[PDB]
């Protein structure tokens with residue numbers, strides 16, 4: 001029945017990414033002093049069944065000027081590498097056990113931006129043309145900030161797999177010891193996935209609407225359901241790579257219970273920001289990475305290398 | 319002969335500007351901060367120095383049998 005363990009995953013998650021869109025504007029509602037979608041629910045909890053159905057009724061135009069062969073294979077992705085990445089992710093028991101799999105995320109973190117470059121180019125001119133070009137450029141310069149500061153800690157835990165990374169955070173919430181890094185693990189995923197303070201990719205201010213501009217109701221649910229299938233995953237990751245829970249070979253169930261009451265707090269962070277801060281004006285946006293974020297990330301790497309060796313600490317792995 | 323202004327008495331309420339409250343300033347931070355980071359590592363160097371002590375124990379059974 002291994003095929004019914006899968007399809008029990010893909011389906012029950014599409015409800016979260018659906019019902020996030022509701023808690024989008026309730027939480028961001030009371031920052032403003034008001035209430036959130038209310039009239040339709042009664043509580044509102046019934047809103048997203050009505051919204052999923054307005055789009056696919058609503059007619060899906062294509063530009064007369066487009067290349068239809070690319071205008072499909074691209075979105076036929078924004079929903080794969082979002083739903084594949086979930087596969088080897090322990091909670092506690094991952095569906096797959098990949099030996100070195102931690103590295104496998106970067107494989108699928110790196111291969112999504114090659115679905116932006118298609119779509120914005122697939123269609124047409126300068127609002128999605130050079131406007132989907134220069135959100136490529138920022139999306140690849142926030143990896144080098146990443147793979148390093150992912151690679152740092154992994155000196156402090158011994159291997160590339162995720163079954164060890166529950167063992168080492170036992171009674172030490174891995175955020176003490178590298179708290180300088182942890183910050184930069186946060187501003188990255190918020191800068192890379194195109195969210196609030198570095199917002200530019202999806203346009204509001206700097207342009208009209210980035211990269212979404214052409215898709216009518218028909219395809220544009222996918223992206224608007226793809227872009228929220230990354231955001232609740234990196235944030236359902238960070239908390240396996242920092243704030244660890246305590247496995248329990250007996251009541252596995254109490255592992256996940258206490259696990260979603262963390263990863264679900266953590267997420268409610270990209271909403272708790274977006275009410276707050278303004279945007280960066282694309283110069284300042286990269287111009288603050290090389291100069292500023294990076295020099296440290298190298299420097300710390302020269303540090304977490306020696307700290308095990310200089311304490312006879314060297315973590316028990318191959 | 320019903321008009322607005324009261325007989326006497328008012329505020330005012332000021333227009334002035336203040337809220338600069340801190341908050342562990344001026345090197346008080348960098349003091350607690352570097353203090354936590356250490357107790358992080360001291361919490362390592364022991365778990366990680368214990369876990370190796372089990373590591374050898376595990377490779378022991380392998381060599382024990384396998385003649």
Ligand SMILES: CCCCCCCCCCCCCCCCCC(=O)OC[C@H](COP(=O)(O)OCCN)OC(=O)CCCCCCCCCCCCCCCCC
Nearest residue numbers: 072073074076077080084097098099100101104107108111
């Ligand atoms: C648009 C519609 C048309 C497209 C439809 C089809 C699209 C397919 C796209 C493929 C995208 C995902 C491919 C990524 C490959 C990743 C494989 C991997 O990393 O598996 C990890 C695992 C490592 O093995 P390890 O854990 O070290 O040892 C276990 C010991 N028991 O490895 C293993 O366990 C062994 C590997 C078994 C899998 C066999 C090889 C699978 C990979 C073939 C991919 C073919 C490329 C397809 C096109 C890719 C384009 C992106």
